[PDB]
Amino acid sequence: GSFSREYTAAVEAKQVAQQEAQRAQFLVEKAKQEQRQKIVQAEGEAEAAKMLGEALSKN
Amino acid sequence: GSFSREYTAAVEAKQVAQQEAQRAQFLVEKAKQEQRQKIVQAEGEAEAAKMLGEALSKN
């Protein structure tokens, strides 16, 4: 009785560990991707503004 | 009378043109700088997230 309970509880803990490890990696990748998109957005608007500034420097 | 009125109106228009040109350059530079700051912020958080992901890939 002790054995089957202990073994089962070990496997159940292992399963939670694996799920939570996957959740951590998922959340990291999500945050990474959102920041990459923010960089693309800002570099884009920075370039638009750079070009407008250059067109002003003429007239 | 016509001359002094015309001359004065020309100079006044020139003055507005110069003020407005400066305003345009000011607004461009302001937008440029805000986007540069957004890039610095996001690259920073992207790097923090990258490092956390690497620390997960071990454990």
Description:
Chain A is mainly alpha-helical. Chain A has one domain (1-59). Chain A is 97% helix and 0% strand. Chain A is built from one helix and no strands. Chain A has one helix at residues 2-58. The interface between A and B is medium-sized, with 22 and 22 residues.
Task: Summarize, please.
The structure is a homodimer of 59-residue chains. Chain A is mainly α.
Give short descriptive properties of this protein.
59 residues, 97% helix, 1 helix, Prohibitin-2 (chains A, B), mainly alpha, homodimer
Portion of residues within helices of chain A: over 70%
Taking all Cα atoms into account, the compactness measure Rg of chain A is 26 Å
Most extensive protein-chain contact, per-chain counts: A-B, 22 and 22 residues
H/E element sequence of chain A: H
> Quaternary state, please?
homodimer
Query: How many discrete structural domains of chain A?
Result: 1
Strand percent estimate of chain A: under 5%
Structural class of chain A: mainly alpha
